Structure 1
Amino acid sequence: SHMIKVLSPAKINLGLWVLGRLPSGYHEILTLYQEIPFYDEIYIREGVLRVETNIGIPQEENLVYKGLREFERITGIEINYSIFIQKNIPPGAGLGGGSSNLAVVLKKVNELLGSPLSEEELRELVGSISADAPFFLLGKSAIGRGKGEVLEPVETEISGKITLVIPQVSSSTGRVYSSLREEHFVTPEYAEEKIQRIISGEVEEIENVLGDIARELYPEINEVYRFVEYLGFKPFVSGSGSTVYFFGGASEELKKAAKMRGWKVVELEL
């Protein structure tokens, strides 16, 4: 008690471009975030600070725990909440699950404490831990510039069936960015034209160089990719992987292949 449930949504990258290297080790990118109706369910209860999951992430490693300790640090209040996260969104899937968890929990806890932090500061608190996290404070559809944190809400003409095929391999975002060569970079002009077209519903214009690389580093991502082609759909890769998505439904043949191979198939409707 007094236990509440809060849904924590996933996202997909509807295209991603890398502009270049930052001194910061990180990279400047352009991307289109899309919130998807695919959720972790998070149970929040009054009690000793605790962040648990159903899949065995250490408490000290969990972004939500990191975020709630920084909440105490920055604001002074001591957080008495017991967090359990049921993880439907797999880590390493390129769907921003941990960053969603972080954003939605810290926003909720903040409200529950009479709003000590402002939407600008809360954005700063979650944003420092994950460039993808601030997106989950706004949700829906947004252009992510900078490293992803500089966000511009947009209306897309994209709707209808979307299917995720998540292999049972966890892609390391860092290992994928670290395989970039100068030949993978594009000018911001090229990418801005591309994002415009995707926004207008031209899904064929989606591309993502981190998916190209993810498919070399993790052959199973490439297996899923090739299998979606075989099914007669154009496949796309979310984030740095591992998720491959397409705009259509899941056949029994895909469902068979996934069951045998250990892939998760998520059918969503945008």
Structure 2
Amino acid sequence: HMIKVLSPAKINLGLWVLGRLPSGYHEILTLYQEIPFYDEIYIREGVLRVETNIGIPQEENLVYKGLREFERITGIEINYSIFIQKNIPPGAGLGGGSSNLAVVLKKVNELLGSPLSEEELRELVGSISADAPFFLLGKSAIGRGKGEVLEPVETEISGKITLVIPQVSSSTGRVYSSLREEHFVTPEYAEEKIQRIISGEVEEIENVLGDIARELYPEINEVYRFVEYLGFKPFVSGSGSTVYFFGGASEELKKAAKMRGWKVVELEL
């Protein structure tokens, strides 16, 4: 009866902030890209539990929060034991928690005769994480609003991408909170940037949350500077901590990573 579901990561191929919302959130423009980098989620019939291999408490886990809201909305008891093998580190800017939430809930909804429609499911996961609705789509999509208003697109981006992930966990809240008015841009500026990236101009990627994350967490800056030294343009996903570049990992990078406690992920798009 136990089943396995894969939970993919994303990167932001550019992110812009338009301004503050009264709710405390921020209006943004970003290009989401799903990457072949997965948590392994095992689902079995049993008492409701959500466990990970990295000691995330159950009450703080977004999957648990979503399953309980599912129980609440539906009146149906969730009799599933969830174990998540976390390959995607929390605070990496890769949406691992949000992906976990989307994929488990999509799956549990299906297993229970689909009481929630596709709009309702997207509402549920979106109310917990703005990054979660993207993972109900996958592939490539422009995220507008807070990220949850999605437009599927076809990009001309392919080939090698290497993620370099330092041990430090970046707080998405602490970074967003550091945003001054000089960091904001008009949506017209950002919309022009995104279409160039979509057409394959990766040099057009930028992300002000990365700029700020590099100064709040000096180790993100060290990774960034190290990638430059290796001869590549570095880019930052989410609010950090992940730095990515379009190329392969050399032995010198792999050694630096092993010494420094960085995680290196070699992907092909």
TM-score (normalizing by structure 2) = 1.00
- Once the 2 structures are TM-superposed, how far is the Cα of residue 40 of structure 1 from its aligned partner? 0.1
Aligned position for 2:44: 45
C-alpha separation between the residues in 2 aligned to 1:242 and 1:193? 26
- Once the 2 structures are TM-superposed, how far is the Cα of residue 128 of structure 1 from its aligned partner? 0.2
Q: CA RMSD in A?
A: 0.3
- Once the 2 structures are TM-superposed, how far is the Cα of residue 55 of structure 1 from its aligned partner? 0.3
Query: 4+ residue stretches of structure 1 with deviation over 4 A?
Result: none
C-alpha separation between the residues in 1 aligned to 2:24 and 2:6? 33
**SS of the residue aligned with 2:65?**
helix
C-alpha separation between the residues in 2 aligned to 1:185 and 1:59? 36
**SS of the residue aligned with 2:89?**
coil
- Once the 2 structures are TM-superposed, how far is the Cα of residue 71 of structure 1 from its aligned partner? 0.3
1:86-136 CA-to-partner distances (Å, cap 9, x unmatched) read 000000000000000000000000000011100000000000000000000
- Once the 2 structures are TM-superposed, how far is the Cα of residue 229 of structure 1 from its aligned partner? 0.1
C-alpha separation between the residues in 2 aligned to 1:18 and 1:66? 28
Aligned position for 1:246: 245
**SS of the residue aligned with 1:259?**
helix
| Structure 1 segment 167-206 matched on structure 2, within 5 A | 167-206=166-205
1:64-85 CA-to-partner distances (Å, cap 9, x unmatched) read 0000000000011000000000
C-alpha separation between the residues in 1 aligned to 2:178 and 2:116? 38
C-alpha separation between the residues in 2 aligned to 1:198 and 1:230? 24
C-alpha separation between the residues in 1 aligned to 2:63 and 2:24? 24
- Once the 2 structures are TM-superposed, how far is the Cα of residue 44 of structure 1 from its aligned partner? 0.1
In structure 2, the gaps of 5 or more residues are none
- Once the 2 structures are TM-superposed, how far is the Cα of residue 10 of structure 1 from its aligned partner? 0.2
C-alpha separation between the residues in 1 aligned to 2:94 and 2:40? 15
- Once the 2 structures are TM-superposed, how far is the Cα of residue 36 of structure 1 from its aligned partner? 0.3
- Once the 2 structures are TM-superposed, how far is the Cα of residue 187 of structure 1 from its aligned partner? 0.1
- Once the 2 structures are TM-superposed, how far is the Cα of residue 156 of structure 1 from its aligned partner? 0.2
**SS of the residue aligned with 1:60?**
helix
1:125-183 CA-to-partner distances (Å, cap 9, x unmatched) read 00000000000000000000000000000000000000000000000000000111100
C-alpha separation between the residues in 2 aligned to 1:125 and 1:25? 19
- Once the 2 structures are TM-superposed, how far is the Cα of residue 253 of structure 1 from its aligned partner? 0.2
- Once the 2 structures are TM-superposed, how far is the Cα of residue 15 of structure 1 from its aligned partner? 0.2
- Once the 2 structures are TM-superposed, how far is the Cα of residue 8 of structure 1 from its aligned partner? 0.1
In structure 1, the gaps of 5 or more residues are none
- Once the 2 structures are TM-superposed, how far is the Cα of residue 12 of structure 1 from its aligned partner? 0.0
C-alpha separation between the residues in 2 aligned to 1:60 and 1:168? 24
- Once the 2 structures are TM-superposed, how far is the Cα of residue 56 of structure 1 from its aligned partner? 0.3
The size of the alignment, in residue pairs, is 269
Identity in percent: 100
**SS of the residue aligned with 1:165?**
strand
**SS of the residue aligned with 2:59?**
coil
TM-score (normalizing by structure 1) = 0.99
- Once the 2 structures are TM-superposed, how far is the Cα of residue 9 of structure 1 from its aligned partner? 0.1
C-alpha separation between the residues in 2 aligned to 1:76 and 1:267? 43
1:27-86 CA-to-partner distances (Å, cap 9, x unmatched) read 100000000000000000000000000000000010000000000000110000000000
C-alpha separation between the residues in 2 aligned to 1:45 and 1:25? 38
